[PDB]
Amino acid sequence: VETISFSFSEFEPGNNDLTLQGAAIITQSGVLQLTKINQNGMPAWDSTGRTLYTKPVHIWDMTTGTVASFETRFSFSIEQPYTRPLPADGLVFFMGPTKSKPAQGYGYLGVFNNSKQDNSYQTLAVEFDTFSNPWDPPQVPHIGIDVNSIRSIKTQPFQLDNGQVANVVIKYDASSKILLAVLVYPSSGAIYTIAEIVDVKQVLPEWVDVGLSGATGAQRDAAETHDVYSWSFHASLPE
Amino acid sequence: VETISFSFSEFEPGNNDLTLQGAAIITQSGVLQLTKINQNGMPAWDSTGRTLYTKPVHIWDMTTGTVASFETRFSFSIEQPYTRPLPADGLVFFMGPTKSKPAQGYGYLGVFNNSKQDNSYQTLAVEFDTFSNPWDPPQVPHIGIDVNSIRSIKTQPFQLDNGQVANVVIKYDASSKILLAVLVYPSSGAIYTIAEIVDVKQVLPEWVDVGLSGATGAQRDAAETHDVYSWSFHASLPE
Ligand SMILES: *[C@@H]1O[C@H](CO)[C@@H](O[C@@H]2O[C@H](CO)[C@@H](O[C@@H]3O[C@H](CO)[C@@H](O)[C@H](O[C@H]4O[C@H](CO)[C@@H](O)[C@H](O)[C@@H]4O)[C@@H]3O[C@@H]3OC[C@@H](O)[C@H](O)[C@H]3O)[C@H](O)[C@H]2NC(C)=O)[C@H](O[C@@H]2O[C@@H](C)[C@@H](O)[C@@H](O)[C@@H]2O)[C@H]1NC(C)=O
Ligand SMILES: OC[C@H]1O[C@@H](O[C@H]2[C@H](O)[C@H](O)[C@H](O)O[C@@H]2CO)[C@H](O)[C@@H](O)[C@H]1O
Ligand SMILES: OC[C@H]1O[C@@H](O[C@H]2[C@H](O)[C@H](O)[C@H](O)O[C@@H]2CO)[C@H](O)[C@@H](O)[C@H]1O
Ligand SMILES: *[C@@H]1O[C@H](CO)[C@@H](O)[C@H](O)[C@H]1NC(C)=O
Ligand SMILES: [Ca+2]
Ligand SMILES: [Ca+2]
Ligand SMILES: [Mn+2]
Numbered sequence: 398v399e400t401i402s403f404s405f406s407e408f409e410p411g412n413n414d415l416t417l418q419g420a421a422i423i424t425q426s427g428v429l430q431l432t433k434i435n436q437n438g439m440p441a442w443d444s445t446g447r448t449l450y451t452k453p454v455h456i457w458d459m460t461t462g463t464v465a466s467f468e469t470r471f472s473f474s475i476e477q478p479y480t481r482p483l484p485a486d487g488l489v490f491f492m493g494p495t496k497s498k499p500a501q502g503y504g505y506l507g508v509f510n511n512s513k514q515d516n517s518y519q520t521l522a523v524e525f526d527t528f529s530n531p532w533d534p535p536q537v538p539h540i541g542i543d544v545n546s547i548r549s550i551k552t553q554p555f556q557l558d559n560g561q562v563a564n565v566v567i568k569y570d571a572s573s574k575i576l577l578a579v580l581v582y583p584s585s586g587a588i589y590t591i592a593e594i595v596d597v598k599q600v601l602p603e604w605v606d607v608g609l610s611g612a613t614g615a616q617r618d619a620a621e622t623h624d625v626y627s628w629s630f631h632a633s634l635p636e
Numbered sequence: 637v638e639t640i641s642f643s644f645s646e647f648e649p650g651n652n653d654l655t656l657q658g659a660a661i662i663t664q665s666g667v668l669q670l671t672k673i674n675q676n677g678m679p680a681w682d683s684t685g686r687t688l689y690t691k692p693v694h695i696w697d698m699t700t701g702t703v704a705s706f707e708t709r710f711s712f713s714i715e716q717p718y719t720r721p722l723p724a725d726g727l728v729f730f731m732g733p734t735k736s737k738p739a740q741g742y743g744y745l746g747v748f749n750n751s752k753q754d755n756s757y758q759t760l761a762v763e764f765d766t767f768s769n770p771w772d773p774p775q776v777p778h779i780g781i782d783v784n785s786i787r788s789i790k791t792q793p794f795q796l797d798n799g800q801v802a803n804v805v806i807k808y809d810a811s812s813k814i815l816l817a818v819l820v821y822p823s824s825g826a827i828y829t830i831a832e833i834v835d836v837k838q839v840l841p842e843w844v845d846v847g848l849s850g851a852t853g854a855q856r857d858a859a860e861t862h863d864v865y866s867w868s869f870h871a872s873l874p875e
């Protein structure tokens with residue numbers, strides 16, 4: 398069995414196990430600020446930032462036909478400090494082709510280039526979307542399972558606990574082809590779940606990068622924090 | 637859309653919306669004790685108890701082919717206070733034929749009669765199993781998805797937080813046929829998930845009872861509490 402796993406209980410600046418793209422920085426206190434926080438402590442609009450795990454993950458093999466099972470977990474907080482305009486745009490965990498660079502910001506969350514359903518993306522993502530774009534359901538925030546498109550195949554509305562920490566669990570079972578995501582707010586005890594059938598060999602390349610991305614909006618103060626406090630991942634490819 | 641739903645933030649004695657079976661009592665403090673607590677506060681062995689919602693739930697319709705989606709949530713605690721022997725047996729949420737009475741206790745959890753795979757059970761269940769029977773995985777406790785058998789089609793080990801309250805979310809989407817279950821321990825933050833494909837059209841009857849059952853073990857002090865503090869449910873049958 399070919400397995401790979403990492404576990405960041407906090408984030409430390411400088412360590413070359415994570416690549417920081419765009420606006421993403423790691424604070425001295427250990428927080429991954431995906432999008433920019435101004436000097437006054439307020440989130441900046443027109444910001445996009447990602448991080449990628451530096452080593453690639455073997456997810457499936459075309460010769461042997463085997464598909465890996467995987468699971469990722471992270472804790473994040475989104476603080477929306479303004480009533481007007483609406484906050485934007487969200488954060489997302491995404492898996493796709495290696496050596497990728499930040500795509501379009503705003504409602505494309507740094508992962509996609511437009512709203513088109515296109516297999517050439519080769520990207521699977523679980524989004525936590527805070528702004529209702531024309532391709533979105535009306536309710537925000539919502540969890541979404543994104544398969545080669547920012548237009549989710551499945552969405553689940555959830556109520557933001559503004560400024561508080563959420564715990565995310567995402568798991569894929571290759572035998573059932575079930576992709577599963579759970580959000581828990583320890584502050585309130587709220588639990589949200591979403592699941593859908595994802596055939597990974599049809600979606601992802603054989604080797605992928607895993608990463609996290611966030612984006613703020615396209616007009617002044619259409620913004621919110623996208624802080625991540627911890628991140629772990631594990632995959633096991635049968636041989 | 638044919639919809640049914642209930643919600644108990646606590647339980648009160650006498651409420652005719654819940655039928656109590658076997659050893660199940662509702663204390664004055666509002667707790668549903670599925671299995672017998674002795675007068676010294678210690679859980680009794682050789683105990684089986686269940687509760688049923690008094691109204692049936694329309695899960696699917698034969699003439700139209702539509703299948704309902706549903707979700708249940710409850711909080712429970714299991715305390716294992718004896719150092720010997722091993723505790724037993726667990727508790728379970730189950731859906732099956734209406735007007736049912738308690739089945740066999742011990743490892744059958746008050747829901748099944750034997751360890752057979754028998755489609756005439758017509759019973760779907762999500763178990764939280766504390767004793768490893770010959771048909772069980774070796775790890776206990778574990779979550780299990782039971783389809784017409786106490787022999788789970790899928791299990792997930794989890795670590796008991798002795799005496800602490802756990803929150804359970806169980807969700808079924810009829811379109812993807814994904815049955816999902818989540819357990820969260822607020823006391824520790826632990827999160828556990830499990831999911832598997834279930835075609836309730838081939839499993840459950842058209843109308844079902846929903847319920848909770850618990851059982852202690854078959855020898856002295858092979859026992860533990862099975863207390864439930866809240867229970868909610870919701871099903872929506874498309875038309
Ligand atoms: C969202 O949009 C991003 C911005 O466009 C995409 O990124 C760009 O992707 C293109 C590939 O389509 C990259 O361009 C290539 O760069 C390589 C390496 O230098 C060149 O070898 C390659 O050129 C050769 O192939 C071309 C056909 O593709 C031929 O036309 C050409 O003659 C060569 O034979 C090509 O470079 C371009 O060639 C055409 C010229 O007009 C152009 O000037 C020149 O750049 C490009 O580098 C890349 N940009 C960035 C910032 O990454 C992005 O695409 C995804 O990511 C890239 C890296 C690839 O992995 C794609 O397969 C993938 O789709 C896309 N993002 C997503 C998620 O879709
Ligand atoms: O307000 C945040 C959203 O902005 C969207 O872009 C809009 C932009 O703010 C401006 O108003 C422009 O004139 O219109 C576009 C809408 O097409 C952005 O697409 C969305 O994701 C949010 O960031
Ligand atoms: O110890 C608890 C378990 O008991 C199991 O029954 C056993 C019983 O305890 C006694 O030892 C008897 O002689 O053997 C049986 C095993 O067949 C019970 O089946 C299990 O669910 C637990 O309750
Ligand atoms: C389970 O036991 C009860 C009581 O004997 C019986 O009525 C029921 O038909 C049994 N079901 C199965 C599948 O054996
Ligand atoms: Ca959006
Ligand atoms: Ca058992
Ligand atoms: Mn969305």
Ligand SMILES: [Mn+2]
Binds near residue numbers: 772773
């Ligand atoms: Mn079991």
Ligand code: NA
Binds near residue numbers: 474476560561562
């Ligand atoms: Na905060």
